[model samples]
Target chain A: KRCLFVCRHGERMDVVFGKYWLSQCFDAKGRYIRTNLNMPHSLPQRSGGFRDYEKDAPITVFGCMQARLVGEALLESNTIIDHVYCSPSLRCVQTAHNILKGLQQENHLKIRVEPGLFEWTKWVAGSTLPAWIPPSELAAANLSVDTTYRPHIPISKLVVSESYDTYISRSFQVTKEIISECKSKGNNILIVAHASSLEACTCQLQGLSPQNSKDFVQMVRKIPYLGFCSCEELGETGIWQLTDPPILPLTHGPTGGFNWRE
Target chain B: RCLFVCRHGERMDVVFGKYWLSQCFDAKGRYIRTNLNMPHSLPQRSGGFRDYEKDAPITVFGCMQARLVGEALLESNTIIDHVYCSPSLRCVQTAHNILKGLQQENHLKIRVEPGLFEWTKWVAGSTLPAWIPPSELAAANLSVDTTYRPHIPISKLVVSESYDTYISRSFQVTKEIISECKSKGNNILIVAHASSLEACTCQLQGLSPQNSKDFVQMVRKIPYLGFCSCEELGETGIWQLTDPPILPLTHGPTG
Candidate 1:
């Protein structure tokens, strides 16, 4: 099952909507607000609040718009997306489904909803997202969804949550299943998820290890929305080869709507 | 093509649970509640939590129950292209859950038909409950059903039909579903009520609905909870019934 690829969903623009938008998250001030494993090295973010449930928050409108565009990119490129797999986040769901709508064949494609495809390090109370739309809701919204889909639930973070190392390894197991299972000759797989999961999926497909994970992400951390990487399986040689995936070219600010700033 | 027929699994029984709501309805009509509704059990409480209006919801345990059934279907590598289910709260949730389990690789759609409502027990023969509005159904956030545009009437049943009309409607709906699926040329699944399944399965197998009760009674005795019976249709209008689905497993005090 070499015909596999993972996409980082469109730019998360939820901040404008009183929600969180990962890297773009900023406070009233100009400082970087959040971090992955530790503190934001030097990004614009703020820290202040009584507290609220992170799971209740949804994705931004800007993000959905970009997600729609990402789907369009797939359609325009004649991307033969036979199956779609997605994280349970609103942003990922939005992006993944819109890709089908963009193909002008929303009714013909099914998106398998994987609930556990989150960033390994983002498992804290601050970052956890309860499923925004259950698989059934996705189907009701005119999107074909495999709501029964689930990933291997990670071992643990103790009470703290899972670590990046555990996550990368977790991804290795997950994608292997997707390939061996979903891979049917002549068809391809399309996945939409977060930056962290995107990186892990890439690492797994490329045979990169935890040691190369951090460096690989740093090399392309600024990978724009809908960026993806494809892999091919060599003839029964028990070998997998990586191919440069088609890109989601930089569009100048969602083609006239709200523009997200870095 | 093989038609797989089954019932919604482990839902709150409306009769015992007391959840249906209507205005100026039949006085003698004994509706339902949210109990597990097993035969040998005590009278259970339905939590009065179920909703059947435009946006009716299933019980808490309903969605998960549907999930496990769906997982089993996937485990066996059963591939179905479409879904047909009753518009009832539990059935919709069951169909929704089952689809998730099938791991659809294409655009997924469902036909939520009223004809699939229970033949003897439910809102038929002058007792059909009024439905909530579309906007209201959307507001309820029940499922992706918000995007669904049903071919049959959804909410607001202002008038009741004669028993003859109800029975004919049921038969017509079942035939239409089978025919449509047949034309589509792929295996299809129908998630309906007990009476609905009895009628559909019987018809596909060429049994007279003259005594649907016999079929129902027979099924009640032998059918497993969420039991699946597949009857393959021959070109010559015959049902070669065989290979029932993996038996629906029972769970303990679950959500």
Candidate 2:
């Protein structure tokens, strides 16, 4: 009904390959930091000084490689990425940047980071914490913006922990608002977020009831990293149309694609 | 649901004081079309590089128009995800400038499709000049993904397309490009000439083949191409413009 949430490509989670449940990971000092994939950061980073989780928290090279392919695929797919509603998470920003770099459209791309778009996980629950990076920092890391895009929804715009109903309800509200914005502007939405939140947005965009969101969520949780789908609102009705959309491996005929088709 | 077709812009034909004429064509080389010129419109002038088309290029103003169209679409929130442009110099240039303003965040290669070419080759007995080569057009930084290639080549268009052939082909090309582009996916934009658009627009709008609306008059003018994504389409195939504005036999410059 509004937007299709896209899981950033590849793995940033330091597990053995595709698994996101392990505890090992990499850090920003250009040195890999070993940690349980299930481990949470904020529980300790609470005292490790400041700055949005350290630059090491960014998406990994493999993750970036796949995301760059997504960017290239976007070009090959012949679809315009009008507005990218990205989560404020550092990795997601990096993911979106890699996609754009493939697009060769680094200038004037309208990107907006919404704090509400952040994932709803505390990671192993005893807890973790989070923009929480300014766009300046993101840009300095070469996450430059080129087109028309929305600003990060502001840290104050993020919601704290909540019950299932409250959390999902906000998802529905924000999803509807984003859809409204899209209708006036070519009505195309490409969203980027964590696995849990991607499920929430896709469920809502598909017209699934909030109460039943988890079923759809569970279904999407299995999607590979950088796995993506293209969807559209059916207008007056809240129905959304998502055909089989996976651009990375090249699913359709040639457009931005290569010569194999000839 | 169908496709969008557009005119290039104010052309060299009327850039301050200019027009495409036969006197300068022997000075050949090729490019791409659908432009209208009034023979009587120009006075007797011999020699000189001839203000008309040496390359049959668009005017500086037309480039501005092309850029404006892209921005207008952006303002209306219509992102041109994929572009199918006429192989003509004017249209390719138009597509290039449009991208600058639209700023589509994808590395979409503008496919140069000849089916979307204007009606001028048949309308006026002008075939492309020998100088304009597909390689040259493919090389121009107009964001082109491919050189101008026609799926069904029309050899010796110098004889002009038969009236019936032109009309039917216009509709056929319209349908074919729409399907081809739509298959590629999402908001499709076509940079083409007037009559071609008129035919295509009429087809989607439900005008029958013999319908008068399918034909473009000398004065017919349309600057906007209404192609949009599936969401913007209605069951009837015609899209209700969310904003801005046209279709048909157009005289004068591209857009």
Candidate 3:
């Protein structure tokens, strides 16, 4: 039997958009007087803050609470999961540790460190900002245009283009390979990956067209965090029947575009 | 072929003897000390006054130097059947890290034995009077004792006599490990500090007692830092023709 579990990380600081604003000071004649406008305030610092909590961020106090809730939810829902795999990134590592802590099985399980489980590397490797950019300046820079750009580009242009289709494809390939390997070894597998990668992999598993940036923006804007989908294997046919539709609430966003691939 | 390589480390702090007492006391004889009684005198203090660098504390540097040599041996890619290290904390940690750095094929084959440690516990435990100069005191203290002595003596005596029997027992244990390794056809690696390592090697090589410490002293006095391989060759036998001579290769200064 093929069984896989998937989930996205908790909300990050980068997701809280429009907290910063650009403004200009105008004099009486409505002619340009000064370009300096007060920058917008950032979203109130949440549990994990805005930084990628890889090495520096301790599992934020709230993230731990979320993980515990997920763990208790799983324990009540399923008897046991055969094998577990996780991204080696700090946040995921902390999340997995927190879940295990709540389950009271910390010593019995060992976390396999798979770099492929990481969030799309494009997000980290392609930032154009200087390392020393003050938070205030970053708040004023409009990144909405970049976020809604193309989904794919030639391999040579990947570094320059913000599109991440290739990254999503690779993430799906790795997740699929891990799931196949675990199935061959007679173990049910649980994969903890980022939302985009999860969406990409789930699309592939259900045999649907890959979603572009616009599609992702619309779907993800609603439930920004905490989403899950389940699939079950049909005997001998090498096909999976979706046991549960992606159960996100419709009020979060318009829902007709929900589709699946094999 | 399974072989054992051992060497003495570079120079260190604890003055042969007198300097230790001087460093332990101030001008007013108050105890002025650091961990391991590292020498704080002007001359000794010049080159990083660390417990791991003094002449008397050769074991510390010696262990590290041995680790470097061990790494070279591992790089040669020869299969090491087994490793036996002296259980001295410095020696054991040295052997363990060297193996770790080399990260030889498998880790399970390494073991530690108390018997493989140096035989000259006498000099290590000996103390000197406060008035003597540090330079002359090491030889003075070494000359007075040929056997091991405990630091705190019974019956309230300031110092106890050397224990020759204990030294013999230590030697016997060393011999047993060598024999067991030979019986199993396993190559052995032993890491140890200066005085005791030399004495054990001398006993293994069948060198005369008169030449034992002197010969060991000459090799120990040199700056060789890592393993030395020794093998027993039969006299007037077919096996003797194929048997290799014991060889000592120097690993450069560790300090």
Candidate 4:
């Protein structure tokens, strides 16, 4: 039985550290210091200044732990995730890395970064995409990344201001390609991505049309960290049907936001 | 300048159901969470279950509690220049979270002092618990100062150390911590076990150490993350306990 697990990354450092965190952590000289426990100690250097990190943030300490819990839960259920696909974002990559470690497959499996798996670019800073950390930098950090894997949508080909419908199409198409490629490896595959990727990846597979921006944002916002959706291939019919997640979804308490003034 | 001493927040064993060590790990020795209250992962450490049994990590919520205290301190405009923590995993975890909350983790590194740990008499056996090395903690991305030397080394901790010895050790270490702070012209924060609230301060505050039974009773009443504040009285080197800078956290039943 072929199953696809789509999950969102966990809590981010920018939200926990406030707007000034990047400025506070990085000096004018561009030296980076981890100012918070939730912040990552090492950051991948970008083409631009360190301020480029503002848009591309990593997950918090607890965020990594959240993914590990989901991984442990999957392993406990005797679920074997044969192949792992992840968004190019650092947060998503880190999430995939920790999840594989929890599944005891850190040494066996490698993450395939898919640029098409990223969130809608229009939601980015005025349609300007983040200066993503190169796969080489990620590999240097000991993150198990399939650096040689060619992304379905190369970073150069990604539309600067892709529309909501375009994003849905990209996610669906990318997810399909991942499933098709992973068939040789095993039936079960996992994709770690943004919150919107959950519905964007599965809704089309379930034969649903793309949602408008208003509805899409509302739906994605409701999905919690490490929240997941699943789909399974319906026999040899070549049709995919949405199914309940193999393991239980995480239920955590409200994580209060940090206010700079208060 | 004032000195702030605090206990680490809720631990895993206390929040999780009974026999967590036995039930929390799988046949392969991997951590398996049976409940949400337990931490999803533990810090990288040396040794196996024997070390793990004595060194339980704090729960995720415990990290939250410590962060709250740090946030309060920041909001109060308290500038903590020096941060010290007991070498225990729970205490180190709490100190790191607090530093994060204060937004000072980059500027400050926690000094993991073995002398700040709780009384050693509570150990089940005659050997000391194998604690994770400071280097490993630093590698784990915690803001621990691996370079700083501990006042009491692991070998000096001794098996089943007496209550009086524990008090003297904590006092001596804390005095040195305070002296360093004074010399550096900075206020400091100490994150340790509940007994540290007394053990670290009683002698420094010019009070005699509490009896063993009384010490246990006092610790039993102090809530998790409960804190004590001390102020230096002029140049006399005399310390006096003051009202806690933060309000005591209290909660009703989860009704």
Local accuracy of candidate 4 as per-residue lDDT tens digits, A105-167:
998998999999999898787757888887887888778898888888899989988887888
Q: By descending lDDT, how would the candidates be arranged?
A: 4, 1, 2, 3
Task: Tell me, by TM-score, which candidate is best.
Answer: 4
- For each of the candidates, give the backbone clash count: 30, 34, 22, 0
Candidate 1: where is the Cα deviation over 4 Å?
Answer: A17-53, A121-123, A126-132, A148-160, A212-220, A253-262, B1-255
Model 4 residue A204 distance off true place after TM-score fit, in angstroms: 1.6
Residues forming the 10-long window of minimal summed lDDT in candidate 1 chain B: B36-45
Best by lDDT: 4
Number of the top DockQ candidate: 4
Per residue, candidate 4 scores C-alpha lDDT tens digits across B1-255 of: 799998887776655534667767888888776555566676656667547677778876678778878987886788998999988888988999999989988989999998888888876557777788889999877899988988778778878888888888887898788777776856789999888887788887777778988888677656677778988888677788887666443221100
- How good is the docking of model 1, as DockQ? 0.01
Which of candidates 3 and 4 is the stronger one according to TM-score? 4
- lDDT preference between candidates 2 and 4, better one: 4
Taking all chains together, each candidate's TM-score versus the true structure is 0.39, 0.40, 0.34, 0.59
Give the CAPRI class of candidate 3: incorrect
C-alpha lDDT values of all predictions: 0.54, 0.52, 0.43, 0.79
Better of 1 and 4 by lDDT: 4
Model 1, B1-255: lDDT tens digits are: 667776775433332233334421135533422122221111111332223332344443444445656766776677776677776656766776777666652356666666666653445334554444334433443333445455456452224444445456666776777676666656777787666665666556676655545554554542212545565555776676675555334322210
In model 3, the runs with Cα more than 4 Å from the true position are A11-59, A125-162, A245-262, B1-255
